[PDB]
Amino acid sequence: MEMDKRIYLELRNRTPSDVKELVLDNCKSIEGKIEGLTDEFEELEFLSTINVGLTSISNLPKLNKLKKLELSENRISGDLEVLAEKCPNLKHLNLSGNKIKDLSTIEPLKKLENLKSLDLFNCEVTNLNAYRENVFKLLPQVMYLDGYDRDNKEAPDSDVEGYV
């Protein structure tokens, strides 16, 4: 079952509008098209595409209820400017192992004022000095980067009740 059929299999259990989370994990794509991810996904919040061979994300539908997009382990070397349209509500984006090597590539992300957390694990920006500090210079929305916030604290899951 290819990328589209992986999606199709789940869409059989529930229609795109009812799919809150659907992951394409290590699934061979059609070619360079997702196909299955249409803007029929009303309440699609969590989605991952771990190692599916996506070089460009110019196949994204306008998911206005999105929350988490894992694009980790893909040949993403740009084409992020499409996110301003398809993801004007996304706060969580994983670029783990993606070919985002320069701060110029993350500039389109400043258009997404909802972004709160970025994952740069094994991302190409690791070859940059003070990569976190430089990201906060451009992207002023994200509060968390690689698990640590602006205070250099690991994102508290319980002990964040206005105290430290």
Contact assessment for residue 103 and residue 135, using Cβ atoms and an 8 Å cutoff: yes
**CATH code for the domain in which residue 126 is found:** 3.80.10.10
**Could you tell me where the DSSP H helices lie in 23-146?**
83-86, 131-138
Instruction: State how far the Cα of 160 lies from the Cα of 157, in Å rounded to an integer.
Output: 7
**Could you tell me where the DSSP H helices lie in 19-104?**
83-86
b/e map 143-162, b = 16+ CB within 10 Å:
bbbbeebeeeeeeeeeeeee
Instruction: State how far the Cα of 114 lies from the Cα of 29, in Å rounded to an integer.
Output: 29
Distance of CA 27 to the CA centre of its chain: 17
Distance of CA 120 to the CA centre of its chain: 11
Q: How many other CB atoms sit within 10 Å of the CB of residue 140? A: 11
Contact assessment for residue 52 and residue 75, using Cβ atoms and an 8 Å cutoff: no
Instruction: State how far the Cα of 38 lies from the Cα of 18, in Å rounded to an integer.
Output: 13
Angle, vertex CA 21, rays to CA 141 and CA 82, nearest 5:
45
Residue 67 sits in which domain range? 1-164
Q: How many domains does the chain have?
A: 1
Beta-sheet pairing, 144-145 with 148-149: antiparallel
- If phi > 0 it is left, if psi is from -120 to 50 it is alpha, else beta; for residue 90 that is beta
- Rg over alpha carbons for the chain, rounded to the nearest Å, is 16
